[PDB]
Amino acid sequence: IANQFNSAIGKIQDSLSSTASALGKLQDVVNQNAQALNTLVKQLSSNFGAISSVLNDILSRLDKVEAEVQIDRLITGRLQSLQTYVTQQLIRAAEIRASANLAAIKMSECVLGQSKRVDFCGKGYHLMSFPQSAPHGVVFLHVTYVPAQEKNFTTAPAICHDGKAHFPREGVFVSNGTHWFVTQRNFYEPQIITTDNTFVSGNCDVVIGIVNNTVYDPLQPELDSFKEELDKYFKNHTSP
Amino acid sequence: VSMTKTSVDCTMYICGDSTECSNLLLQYGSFCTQLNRALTGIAVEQDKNTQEVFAQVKQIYKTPPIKDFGGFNFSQILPDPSKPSKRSFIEDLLFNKVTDLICAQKFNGLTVLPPLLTDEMIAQYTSALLAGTITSGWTFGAGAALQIPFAMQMAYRFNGIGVTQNVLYENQKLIANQFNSAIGKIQDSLSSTASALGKLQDVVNQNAQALNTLVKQLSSNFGAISSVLNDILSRLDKVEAEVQIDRLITGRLQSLQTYVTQQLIRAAEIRASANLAAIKMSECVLGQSKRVDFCGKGYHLMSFPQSAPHGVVFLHVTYV
Amino acid sequence: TDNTFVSGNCDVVIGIVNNTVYDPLQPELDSFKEELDKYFKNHTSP
Amino acid sequence: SQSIIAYTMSLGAENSVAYSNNSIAIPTNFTISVTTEILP
Ligand SMILES: *[C@@H]1O[C@H](CO)[C@@H](O[C@@H]2O[C@H](CO)[C@@H](O[C@H]3O[C@H](CO)[C@@H](O)[C@H](O)[C@@H]3O)[C@H](O)[C@H]2NC(C)=O)[C@H](O)[C@H]1NC(C)=O
Ligand SMILES: *[C@@H]1O[C@H](CO)[C@@H](O[C@@H]2O[C@H](CO)[C@@H](O[C@H]3O[C@H](CO)[C@@H](O)[C@H](O)[C@@H]3O)[C@H](O)[C@H]2NC(C)=O)[C@H](O)[C@H]1NC(C)=O
Ligand SMILES: *[C@@H]1O[C@H](CO)[C@@H](O[C@@H]2O[C@H](CO)[C@@H](O[C@H]3O[C@H](CO)[C@@H](O)[C@H](O)[C@@H]3O)[C@H](O)[C@H]2NC(C)=O)[C@H](O)[C@H]1NC(C)=O
Ligand SMILES: *[C@@H]1O[C@H](CO[C@@H]2O[C@@H](C)[C@@H](O)[C@@H](O)[C@@H]2O)[C@@H](O[C@@H]2O[C@H](CO)[C@@H](O)[C@H](O)[C@H]2NC(C)=O)[C@H](O)[C@H]1NC(C)=O
Ligand SMILES: *[C@@H]1O[C@H](CO)[C@@H](O[C@@H]2O[C@H](CO)[C@@H](O)[C@H](O)[C@H]2NC(C)=O)[C@H](O)[C@H]1NC(C)=O
Ligand SMILES: *[C@@H]1O[C@H](CO)[C@@H](O[C@@H]2O[C@H](CO)[C@@H](O)[C@H](O)[C@H]2NC(C)=O)[C@H](O)[C@H]1NC(C)=O
Ligand SMILES: *[C@@H]1O[C@H](CO)[C@@H](O[C@@H]2O[C@H](CO)[C@@H](O)[C@H](O)[C@H]2NC(C)=O)[C@H](O)[C@H]1NC(C)=O
Ligand SMILES: *[C@@H]1O[C@H](CO)[C@@H](O)[C@H](O)[C@H]1NC(C)=O
Ligand SMILES: *[C@@H]1O[C@H](CO)[C@@H](O)[C@H](O)[C@H]1NC(C)=O
Ligand SMILES: *[C@@H]1O[C@H](CO)[C@@H](O)[C@H](O)[C@H]1NC(C)=O
Ligand SMILES: *[C@@H]1O[C@H](CO)[C@@H](O)[C@H](O)[C@H]1NC(C)=O
């Protein structure tokens, strides 16, 4: 388990070393803030119909009545440029808030604890995650237990022994072909079916697909060996 | 989950067939490109939102031909090979109920691109998700799919709500009969009314209305002598025409900035809905919610996705 | 034995320690042995 | 001999599941896997 984890962290350094696209979202946000700034700058150059883009030149050619017309184009167009960029930015910001609020919830549920939500803390059953800082962002190193070598087995919902019906307390009942066992639902480790592994309800008539086997009782040979202890004190007590 | 991929030629929507208007529009410049970048942003986003909700598994699971699912009769929500498009039964009810203006927009340099995923591809991901859920329980989400007998899955679910697995098996008939009875009402409901789908219809009707309203702003004078560009250009020369055109460019450009601002904002609503739906898939469909009411009222057992026009339906199953 | 469960042998668990583990069934039977032995002994008597 | 092609996207590999009314699969082994997830 430790070796697989060490092997996986190795692959993270390798992955981040190998591809350009990994930090995609963060590199995207930076590109969008810079592109929007340069777009805002570039509207300063636009004439809007005024005889120049350069505000002093206009003063140098027109009086207070005609400069007011030409300048009011640049003010109206420019003010429309700031009202545009700030709208795009208030919207952009609203995307980032939803991202941040998820990232806060993931910090709480994937770092300060272990989530049961499926695929919420990366693909596979969650074990833990390690947070890492980035330019304007966070990276989570999610650690999961992914099933890897499955094998086919026969199963039955329940077992009949004393003509009562029996169920796993936790786990499932499975046959290797020749013998029935009980095991945990998420890793193969078969066990002898016993009273302690199981619980009982009703007779064998209602449960569809129920099968017949023994149930072993760990009290029983502890009393059988105590019956054979008892008989040996009787045979000895026949001797005197 | 998504909406129409609008695309507009801003030059088309401001300056349709005028070079005079084109030269005047260059006095403003990048506003035309900038809006197209914004609409292109939302248009590419639809393929993300639709991948995020449906493409949660990268392998195409399929049903066995035999249907020994303990009496649970999914045939109403699984695909139908007899159909010209392979959706289920319940998905045709969804497609039949949600609804010249579309040509009038087309003449004005407005366009609607098709989504990357065809509605059959959406039915195909849905088929894999649903068949996976039945044949394999949650296990196909967390790793390679492990088969399980359907009543053994249902026992796990019952234990997931702390109800004991014998309480399933001791009533398996009543449970399957109620599951079948409930899907019978899902059909009867979705066949009868259309009001339950009103969330999707209201999303279409807003997007369609915003395109109608943006179209209807072309027929506006804005205080120029005509609402029609050409009727100015026909009547006035290069001194006078420009002043009446510069008003229509201004009024129209303001009318576009407005529609795009509305649509970026609207698209933030749909993205919240996409993220919620992706989570609802990831937790109710690929899992079992311990979250209360998050997968419908009652204790969560399991949920089945069904495709819908630009959206998704979850059929949540609950113990009550 | 009821608070715990059992798997494997002493080699595999890094840092496993030694102690008794109680069995509640043990003195519950052993007192039944003292009860039994008192019957055995009395049956020597007659 | 490389060229730009066009195709309907195959959504993945096809896989009919080994379902039966009495069949289960169980992992005898597992991978501990680590992923990155990146957030603004
Ligand atoms: C299914 O699992 C069964 C339990 O692991 C297994 O049965 C066991 O088979 C071994 C031999 O492979 C037997 O080993 C014993 O054989 C005799 C018993 O008198 C002794 O000489 C040996 O020392 C050893 O104790 C087990 O007795 C037997 N267990 C049981 C409960 O019968 C099956 O072989 C497995 N089936 C398949 C298809 O592999
Ligand atoms: C699983 O094991 C059960 C115990 O062996 C077995 O039950 C037994 O089945 C037979 C046939 O149904 C019964 O046979 C008797 O039936 C009546 C009396 O009730 C007589 O008319 C017959 O001549 C015959 O004697 C056994 O009495 C019955 N015993 C019990 C406790 O069930 C199941 O049939 C087995 N099932 C499978 C699938 O193997
Ligand atoms: C926990 O209890 C274990 C069982 O008593 C105990 O294992 C025993 O430890 C001693 C000392 O390490 C070993 O002593 C013998 O070691 C070799 C033969 O194996 C000889 O060269 C020595 O002379 C000596 O006889 C026992 O063999 C060993 N028994 C077993 C079954 O492994 C652990 O040491 C105890 N651990 C703690 C921390 O209490
Ligand atoms: C899991 O089982 C399926 C089929 O179920 C078993 O198949 C028989 C061979 C036998 O074991 C029966 O008791 C079961 O019903 C396997 O599917 C087979 O796969 C091979 C290719 O590997 C193919 O040639 C066969 O036609 C398939 N048969 C069926 C019925 O699908 C599957 O491979 C098994 N998986 C593992 C990991 O063992
Ligand atoms: C599952 O439910 C469907 C719907 O009732 C059943 O299919 C119908 O079966 C009857 C009897 O053969 C026919 O009259 C209908 O035309 C069928 N409809 C469809 C859509 O196929 C199906 O038989 C049920 N399966 C089980 C195992 O009960
Ligand atoms: C639990 O409630 C169910 C109904 O939800 C009962 O099932 C019905 O029982 C009557 C007879 O009492 C039958 O006529 C119906 O046809 C049954 N319906 C179904 C769908 O099976 C059930 O009897 C109740 N059980 C208990 C123990 O109260
Ligand atoms: C479980 O899987 C791991 C690999 O993921 C197995 O470990 C390998 O075991 C073989 C020998 O069988 C060695 O050659 C490899 O070098 C091992 N790799 C590691 C990381 O140790 C492990 O043995 C498997 N367990 C079982 C029960 O099969
Ligand atoms: C399982 O399927 C077989 C056919 O392959 C059928 O004959 C049998 O009765 C079924 N058993 C159960 C418990 O469903
Ligand atoms: C038999 O019982 C006597 C006491 O009555 C005792 O001394 C002796 O050790 C016992 N022998 C065996 C083999 O149990
Ligand atoms: C615990 O740490 C000490 C060193 O401080 C070491 O000697 C001991 O063997 C360690 N035991 C385990 C189980 O790691
Ligand atoms: C013998 O044992 C019985 C109890 O079973 C007791 O009542 C009786 O007093 C005993 N007699 C002697 C002589 O020990």
Numbering used by the authors:
A (entry chain B): 923 to 1162
B (entry chain C): 729 to 827, 848 to 1068
C (entry chain A): 1117 to 1162
D (entry chain B): 689 to 728
Sentences from the paper on this structure:
SARS-CoV-2 is an enveloped, positive-stranded RNA virus that enters a host cell by fusing its lipid bilayer with the target cell membrane. S1 contains four domains: NTD (N-terminal domain), RBD (receptor-binding domain), and two CTDs (C-terminal domains), protecting the central helical bundle structure of the prefusion S2. The RBD can adopt either a ‘down’ conformation for a receptor-inaccessible state, or an ‘up’ conformation for a receptor-accessible state; movement of the RBD allows the virus to protect the critical receptor-binding site from host immune responses.
Another VOC, Gamma (lineage B.1.1.28 or P.1), has spread in Brazil and some other countries. There were two classes for the Gamma trimer, representing two one-RBD-up conformations. All mutations except for R190S are located near the N-terminal segment and contribute to reconfiguration of its extended structure. The new conformation of the N-terminal segment appears to stabilize the 70 to 76 loop, disordered in most known S trimer structures. T20N has created a new glycosylation site and Asn20 is indeed glycosylated in Gamma. The three RBD mutations (K417T, E484K, and N501Y) in Gamma also produce no major structural rearrangements. K417T and E484K are probably responsible for loss of binding and neutralization of Gamma by antibodies that target the RBD-2 epitopes. The Gamma variant lost binding to the two RBD-2 antibodies (G32B6 and C12A2) and to one NTD-1 antibody (C83B6), but retained binding to the NTD-1 antibody C12C9 with somewhat reduced affinity, suggesting that these two NTD-1 antibodies target overlapping but distinct epitopes. ACE2 did not dissociate more rapidly from the Delta RBD than it did from the Gamma and Kappa RBDs; one possible explanation for the apparently weaker affinity of the Delta trimer for the ACE2 dimer than other variants is that ACE2 binding induces S1 dissociation. These results suggest that the RBD mutations of the Gamma variant enhance receptor recognition, whereas those in Kappa (L452R and E484Q) and Delta (L452R and T478K) have a smaller effect on ACE2 affinity.
